[PDB]
Design a protein around this ligand. Structure first.
Ligand SMILES: CCCCCCCCCCCCCCCCCC(=O)OC[C@H](COP(=O)([O-])OCC(O)COP(=O)([O-])OC[C@@H](COC(=O)CCCCCCCCCCCCCCCCC)OC(=O)CCCCCCCCCCCCCCCCC)OC(=O)CCCCCCCCCCCCCCCCC
Ligand SMILES: CCCCCCCCCCCCCCCCCC(=O)OC[C@H](COP(=O)([O-])OCC(O)COP(=O)([O-])OC[C@@H](COC(=O)CCCCCCCCCCCCCCCCC)OC(=O)CCCCCCCCCCCCCCCCC)OC(=O)CCCCCCCCCCCCCCCCC
Ligand SMILES: CCCCCCCCCCCCCCCCCC(=O)OC[C@H](COP(=O)(O)OCCN)OC(=O)CCCCCCCCCCCCCCCCC
Ligand SMILES: CCCCCCCCCCCCCCCCCC(=O)OC[C@H](COP(=O)(O)OCCN)OC(=O)CCCCCCCCCCCCCCCCC
Ligand SMILES: CCCCCCCCCCCCCCCCCC(=O)OC[C@H](COP(=O)(O)OCCN)OC(=O)CCCCCCCCCCCCCCCCC
Ligand SMILES: CCCCCCCCCCCCCCCCCC(=O)OC[C@H](COP(=O)(O)OCCN)OC(=O)CCCCCCCCCCCCCCCCC
Ligand code: SF4
Ligand code: SF4
Lengths: 242, 68, 233, 64, 191, 61, 123, 126, 182
């Protein structure tokens, strides 16, 4: 008897009917507070174990950043790879960020994962256009391509790298695009020249010039100061009045 | 349905004129009821047969030989 | 959240598709899974160890085929994966056959999740009800003054994000996909780096494909599941 | 050589009746002697392609 | 109950995480002759052949395109159009929100005071070869002026035909108003 | 509120098939081997019987 | 591991100008030795002497630099370009960026004084 | 003397490249005792690094000495299978031998400049 | 059965056979369970998306405490402007937490004495290594290391304890080299 011809038309089954939808008002940051305290304690331990290297630490919403100098990259990474309580074995990303107001303009960021403990950590160093950073390819082979990309985009030289060359950009590209002084459209363009029978690189001319529209940025301060979510164990003590 | 009885039955429904027109235009033999006509002269049809699959139930018969 | 709510009659059709997708999976498996030639082209090709899988930065099926039970949907759930039941496939031997089996198990678990979501879809809004972050509805933008102001600003200047930075990731079907954003308090990002899962895998190609013949390199590129927009960004 | 073997079997299949039970034994001895060389070929693994970049199978031992 | 040194209750292995052991040729629940028959007679391969052949007798999925179209929705994002009111007046008021939200900078607008004192455009251009067909302009418009039709059949021989201007877009709206009205009557409550 | 939203039914949906459905099919392999051996044995009975008749026809010729 | 390519050089920043001197001279030697390969690989319409003249020009461009770290960066990028040219990674289109002089004369009016540039709105 | 840290052939455990360790507990005890020797010899008593790894190694060594079964050790030491605990011990030993030559207990080698570590929070710069 | 299959054909919304041809198909099929994936045209994507009745009754959805018109000030639900600050700790600020205490465990004098005790750390008076050497057992074992003296592990926001599914409820049978983890 039963077949696809005598099949239940589910389009006419009664649907769930809800009068009022109830959703409580909750702050998404309140979910993180205990973990934040835990990361604070953890970072305190790392700072106390490596006071020669760790300049600082910072903590925001399940993200711990460790603040070190270039000389301190290889030691701290060895610690973060081989120590039993800090088994960050997977390299996730290596990046650079241009802060041209700083004397050391580039901030080289490292992201690490521990599948053992299911935790992530971040490590930040600094660099310039001419001062290099130590390569962590000796520890993480996955860092090769990432460090290459950081060089190609920003110009950060990683000393110790086996083959540091451009990875993203054209084979004779002159410049490092993600620098803030590099323009969006770059300096050159390409066409086919029928005379030379060749693809020729020429200066830039746009039929429609780029329109930024960042002049419409808000003149009023959008978001105030945040909310202090340090635990009381990591706020300095106010002395009793008397 | 990709069977011969389909094309034979439809070509019995739509006469041989429509069969040769459809063979020269669509490549397939379809029988449906006329739904309407547009301002350009294209006729639009709809089928009710179980043989025709999802998204093959509505079709067009253009007026121009250089259809588009 | 989401741009527009679901149109009417979509869950029924998704269920109609789900009632039959399993047989499609089964028909693909009949050709591929127990086949001699498939196993020859896949068994003990592209082998990567768990330790080297971690050192190279691999994730997803590439890391789960080597034996490590890691999935961000279970270890750090983000949207609703903490409210739906699914299993994670993990394989030994680190080969391409194990990755293929992992991906077919992931097909079936995605179907499971789709069933549960079609059964347990709640009511309410699909985007945040804060019109300083999301556009209001049109019938309020065309009757309420605050709604129109907020529409205007969100579509001209944009919403201003607090200053800071975040690396967050998902278990993309390719692996661990991540975005390192920096906010300067402005409406535009200061820095956005995409951690594409294919970048690391194609970087590991040199380690994985050494000692292999050229027909096996094709299988390795195929099991890395390399789309090049993400590799090159 | 194997092609010449299989082509030298053509006289037998065109003479099979006339050489009744004598040439049969002779061609069987022929095939056995030529199967010995095939056995040699298989046991030497002469048509196998060898791989240089072996995977390392040696243990990790730490001098204390 | 337990104190952990460099570890966790979650990082401890599951109960059966150690795989059992490989199986040798002994400890085999399958005779040698049976698996040799499966070896010489290509069992799974004939099964795959049959699963392919079963599809030979199933309905092809192919739709004959110039004569049968595929599925389109009210939300579909295709060729652009400038709409009017039933008055005949044009809806656009040169607010320049579509120009502002457009990620590809495909829209170019210029406006001034019309002779009858109205805020209306003198220039409205879309470079389709810049556009990404995202719909942000159709979402941004407060008067339902710029819209995207369900049309995709407007390919050209020259790229100078894809630099749409105000007259092209208004004619396209005058052409596609009925389809746009179907789509709006279906879609507007959801946006 | 929630008026015209796309929502599921009250008893949900009937469950879908997401587990493997590759059923074992076919006779046990030795049945196929026995059929092969019988087919080829009968073919040999039929062919060798024809060779002998051809030999006798050759005698006649 | 991920092994380096054919003519790769590990990035090692000299702490001395006298060592970087030898490194730069070796790189110059390598470019000069490879110029015939650059003419054969890229279908070049001009002399090998012209290629060596161009190499010498680009090495003279940075001759009177004295900051050591800038010289280190320049050496590293020069070795990058050598690896890109000797290994056939570039195409003719990118290799001939260095050689705009060899392409035919770009028109008649190339200003070199004020009134020319003024009439052409380049002053 | 030499210790066996990792077997790269034989009976496979669920992880690829790691195989069954014969007699793991002696290797663990050897590596832990060597780690303790290196710390007690070449690290200061008051350093937090030494105290950390001493208490860690002693906890794990008591777990390894008192219990005989590998599963019980794997449950009491909350870090993978015992074949992974051996590798963890080996890496900790090598890290201690490396941190002997380095001097993490020392004061900060390179102090940051004041400009470094300023990110868009100071109320008057944007 | 299990909760996840198999399921008959007549419960699958696909166009099949009828009559003698179904009796043949279930005879010649590797799995008669299996379907021909042509959607049932009367039921699939009908009524069309541009002809749904639910559009005329659709209204914008909401939730109660945010749609309320009386006791709902925005500043009580402005979570963007209640964002958590990024805490930064240089070495000076942590030796203060070490030499002195915290607001949870103060170890600082009272009045101006503690004020300039803090000021001696705000400037380079006492160093971080000095404060670690000067730190008692009960400070380290409890505010740097754990009470048991052990170092703290890399924390996990949501710990996930794995379970292996074996046998009949697994995805693949015993022979195959992929397992199932819940
Ligand atoms: C072409 C048509 C395609 C059909 C596709 C369906 C299919 O997969 O066929 C398998 C199908 C059996 O699959 P099944 O439904 O799971 O049957 C399970 C048996 O009952 C399982 O029964 P069993 O293996 O345990 O043994 C029972 C045995 C009786 O046991 C004995 O007495 C031993 C017999 C010794 C000989 O039955 C027979 O021997 C019957 C005579 C078969 C001899 C001819 C074989 C060819 O075999 C057929 O009946 C179709 C024809 C033969 C196979 C396909 C065509 C040749 C290859
Ligand atoms: C020379 C050029 C002439 C070409 C024209 C040939 C046309 C023709 O002979 O029509 C025969 C015509 C074909 O059947 P049909 O009219 O097209 O099927 C209509 C039903 O709606 C079909 O119902 P269905 O859609 O559910 O299909 C079920 C299918 C089920 O097919 C299977 O599952 C069997 C899988 C293949 C088995 C292969 C074993 C060999 O069975 C068949 O179609 C027949 C397979 C034989 O009648 C015969 O079956 C006679 C067979 C000889
Ligand atoms: C062609 C000639 C037929 C040869 C038969 C054959 O292959 O023998 C197989 C036999 C192994 O069979 P076995 O695994 O030990 O037991 C299975 C019981 N169902 O092999 C043997 O046990 C050795 C028999 C040598 C003769
Ligand atoms: C419609 C047409 C149907 C036929 C379509 C077939 C298309 C092409 C088939 C490709 C061959 C399959 C294959 O991949 O062969 C390679 C495979 C290698 O595997 P192997 O190195 O031997 O490892 C052994 C441990 N498993 O080794 C094999 O699996 C080869 C299997 C044997 C090839 C078929 C032999 C047919 C002759 C049967 C002889 C029977 C007499 C021998 C004794 C039988 C005893 C039961
Ligand atoms: C074109 C015709 C396609 C025929 C498709 C049917 C193929 C038969 C098949 O599926 O192989 C079955 C195999 C037995 O498989 P098995 O699971 O190991 O035995 C226990 C089953 N109760 O059977 C065998 O082991 C021998 C393979 C038979 C080959 C059939 C040759 C045609
Ligand atoms: C290798 C091992 C081979 C040994 C095989 C032993 C099998 C014994 C089978 C015995 C069957 C005997 C039936 C018989 O009597 O056959 C007689 C028939 C003769 O044909 P007829 O028309 O009667 O003319 C005769 C004139 N005097 O026909 C014959 O004379 C020929 C009978 C052939 C029987 C089949 C033999 C082959 C068996 C398969 C093995 C080869 C597979 C490859
Ligand atoms: S839909 Fe097209 S025209 Fe409109 S903003 Fe997006 S890309 Fe530009
Ligand atoms: S099309 Fe709409 S959004 Fe664009 S300027 Fe005109 S009214 Fe404004």
């Amino acid at each position: 008897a039963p077949s696809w011809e005598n099949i239940k038309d589910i389009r006419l089954d009664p649907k769930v009917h809800v009068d009022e939808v109830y959703e409580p008002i909750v702050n998404p940051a309140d979910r993180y507070l205990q973990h934040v305290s835990d990361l604070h304690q953890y970072a305190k331990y790392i700072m106390a174990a490596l006071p020669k290297y760790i300049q600082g630490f910072s903590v925001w919403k399940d993200e711990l950043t460790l603040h070190v100098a270039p000389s301190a990259v290889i030691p701290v990474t060895t610690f973060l790879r081989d120590n039993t309580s800090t088994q960050y074995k997977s390299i996730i990303d290596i990046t650079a960020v241009d802060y041209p107001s700083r004397e050391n303009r580039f901030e080289v960021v490292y992201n690490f994962l521990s599948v053992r403990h299911n935790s992530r950590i971040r490590l930040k160093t600094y660099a310039t256009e001419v001062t290099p950073v130590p390569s962590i390819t000796c520890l993480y082979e996955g860092a090769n391509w990432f460090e290459r990309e950081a060089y190609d985009m920003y110009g950060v030289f990683f000393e110790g790298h086996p083959d540091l060359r451009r990875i993203m950009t054209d084979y004779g590209f002159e410049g490092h695009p993600l620098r803030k002084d590099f323009p969006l459209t770059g300096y050159t363009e390409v066409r086919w020249d029928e005379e030379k029978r060749r693809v020729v690189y020429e200066p830039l001319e746009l039929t429609q010039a780029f329109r930024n529209f960042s002049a419409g940025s808000t003149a009023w301060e959008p978001v105030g100061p945040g909310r202090d979510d340090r635990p009381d164990s990591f706020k300095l003590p106010t002395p009793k009045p008397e | 349905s990709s069977s011969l009885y389909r094309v034979l039955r439809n070509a019995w429904e739509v006469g041989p004129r429509s069969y040769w027109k459809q063979l020269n235009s669509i490549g397939d033999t379809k029988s449906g009821r006329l739904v309407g006509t547009d301002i350009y002269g294209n006729k639009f049809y709809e089928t009710d047969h179980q043989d025709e699959i999802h998204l093959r139930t509505r079709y067009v018969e253009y007026k121009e030989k250089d259809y588009d | 959240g989401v741009s527009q709510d679901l149109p009417a009659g979509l869950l029924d059709d998704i269920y109609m598709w789900a009632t039959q997708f399993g047989d499609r999976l089964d028909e693909i498996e009949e050709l591929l899974t127990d086949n001699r030639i498939w196993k020859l082209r896949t068994v003990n090709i592209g082998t990567v160890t768990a330790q080297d899988a971690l050192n190279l930065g691999l994730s997803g099926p590439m890391l789960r085929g080597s034996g490590i039970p890691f999935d961000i949907r279970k270890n750090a759930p983000y949207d609703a994966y903490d409210k739906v039941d699914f299993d994670v496939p993990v394989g030994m031997n680190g080969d391409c056959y194990d990755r293929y089996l992992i991906r077919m198990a992931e097909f079936r678990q995605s179907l499971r999740i789709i069933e549960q979501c079609c059964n347990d879809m709640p009511a309410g809004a699909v985007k945040v009800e804060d019109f300083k972050i999301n556009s209001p509805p049109r019938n309020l933008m065309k009757e309420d003054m605050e709604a129109l102001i907020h529409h205007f600003l969100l579509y001209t200047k944009g919403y201003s994000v607090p200053p800071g930075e975040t690396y967050t990731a998902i278990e993309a079907p390719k692996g661990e996909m991540g975005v390192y954003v920096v906010s300067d308090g402005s409406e535009r990002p200061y820095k956005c780096k995409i951690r594409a899962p294919g970048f690391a895998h194609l970087g590991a190609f040199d380690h994985i494909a050494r000692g292999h013949f050229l027909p096996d390199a094709v299988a390795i590129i195929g099991t890395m599941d390399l789309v090049f927009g993400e590799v090159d960004r | 050589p194997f092609d010449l073997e299989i082509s030298t079997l053509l006289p037998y299949v065109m003479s099979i009746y006339l050489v009744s039970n004598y040439g049969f034994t002779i061609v069987l001895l022929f095939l056995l002697i030529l199967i010995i060389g095939f056995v040699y070929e298989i046991n030497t693994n002469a048509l196998k392609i060898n791989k240089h970049n072996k995977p390392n199978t040696d243990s990790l031992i730490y001098k204390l | 109950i337990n104190i952990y040194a460099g570890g966790s209750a979650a990082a401890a292995p599951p109960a059966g995480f150690r795989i059992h052991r490989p199986a040798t040729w002994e400890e085999s629940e399958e005779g040698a002759l049976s698996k040799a028959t499966k070896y010489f007679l290509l069992a799974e391969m004939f099964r795959g052949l049959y699963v392919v052949l079963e599809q030979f007798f199933r309905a092809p999925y192919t739709i004959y395109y110039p004569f049968e179209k595929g599925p389109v929705s009210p939300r579909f994002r295709g060729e652009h159009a400038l709409r009017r009111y039933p008055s005949g007046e044009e809806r656009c008021i040169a607010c320049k929100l579509c120009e502002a939200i457009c990620p590809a900078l495909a829209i170019t607008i210029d406006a001034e005071e019309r002779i009858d004192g109205s805020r209306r455009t003198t220039k409205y251009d879309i470079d389709m070869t810049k556009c990404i067909y995202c719909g942000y302009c159709q979402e941004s418009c407060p008067v339902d002026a710029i819209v995207e039709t369900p049309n995709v059949e407007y390919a050209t021989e020259t790229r100078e035909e894809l630099l749409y201007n105000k007259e092209k877009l208004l004619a396209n709206g005058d052409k596609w108003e009925l389809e746009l009205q179907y789509a709006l009557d279906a879609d507007a409550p959801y946006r | 509120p929630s008026v015209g939203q796309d929502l599921p039914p009250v008893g949900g949906y009937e469950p879908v098939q997401w587990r493997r459905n590759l059923p074992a099919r076919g006779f046990r392999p030795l049945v196929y081997l026995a059929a092969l051996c019988g087919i080829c044995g009968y073919g040999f009975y039929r062919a060798l019987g024809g060779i002998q008749e051809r030999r006798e026809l050759k005698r006649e010729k | 591991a991920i092994i380096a390519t054919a003519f790769a050089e590990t990035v090692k920043f000299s702490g001395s100008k006298q060592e970087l001197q030898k490194r730069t001279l070796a790189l110059y030697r390598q470019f000069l030795r490879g110029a015939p390969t650059f003419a054969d690989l890229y279908e070049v319409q001009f002399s090998i002497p012209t290629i060596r003249t161009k190499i010498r020009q680009e090495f003279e461009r940075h001759r009177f630099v004295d900051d050591l770290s800038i010289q280190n960066v320049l050496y590293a990028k020069g070795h990058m370009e050598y690896q890109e040219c000797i290994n056939f990674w570039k195409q003719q289109a990118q290799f001939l960026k260095y050689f705009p002089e060899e392409d035919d004369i770009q028109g008649r009016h190339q200003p070199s004084n004020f009134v020319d540039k003024f009439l052409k709105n380049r002053a | 003397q030499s210790v066996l840290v990792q077997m790269r052939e034989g009976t496979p455990i669920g992880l690829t490249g790691i195989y069954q360790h014969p007699n793991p507990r002696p290797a663990l005890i050897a590596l832990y005792e060597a780690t303790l020797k290196e710390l007690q010899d070449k690290h200061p008593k008051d350093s937090v690094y030494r105290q950390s790894i001493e208490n860690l190694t002693a906890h794990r060594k008591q777990i390894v000495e008192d219990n005989e079964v590998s599963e019980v050790i794997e449950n009491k030491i909350g870090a993978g299978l015992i074949e992974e605990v051996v590798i963890q011990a080996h890496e900790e030993l090598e890290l201690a031998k490396k941190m002997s030559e380095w001097k993490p207990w020392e004061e900060l080698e390179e102090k940051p400049l004041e400009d470094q570590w300023v990110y868009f929070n100071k109320k008057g710069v944007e | 059965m299990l909760p996840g299959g198999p399921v008959p054909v007549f419960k699958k919304y696909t166009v099949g056979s009828k009559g003698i041809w179904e009796k043949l198909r279930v005879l010649l099929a590797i799995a008669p369970n299996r379907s021909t994936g042509n959607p049932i045209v009367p039921l699939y994507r009908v009524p069309t998306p541009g002809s749904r009745p639910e559009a005329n009754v659709y209204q914008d959805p909401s939730s109660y405490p945010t749609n309320d018109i009386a006791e709902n000030p925005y500043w009580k639900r402005d979570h963007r402007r209640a964002y958590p600050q990024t805490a930064f700790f240089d070495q000076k600020t942590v030796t203060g937490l070490l030499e002195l205490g915290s607001e949870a465990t103060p170890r600082i004098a009272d009045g101006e004495a503690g004020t300039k005790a803090l000021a001696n750390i705000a400037n380079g008076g006492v160093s971080f290594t000095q404060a670690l050497g000067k730190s008692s057992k009960d400070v380290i074992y409890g505010e740097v290391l754990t009470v048991n003296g052990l170092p703290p592990v890399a924390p996990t926001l949501a710990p996930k304890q794995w379970k292996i599914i074996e046998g009949e409820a697994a995805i693949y049978p015993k022979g195959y080299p992929c397992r199932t983890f819940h």
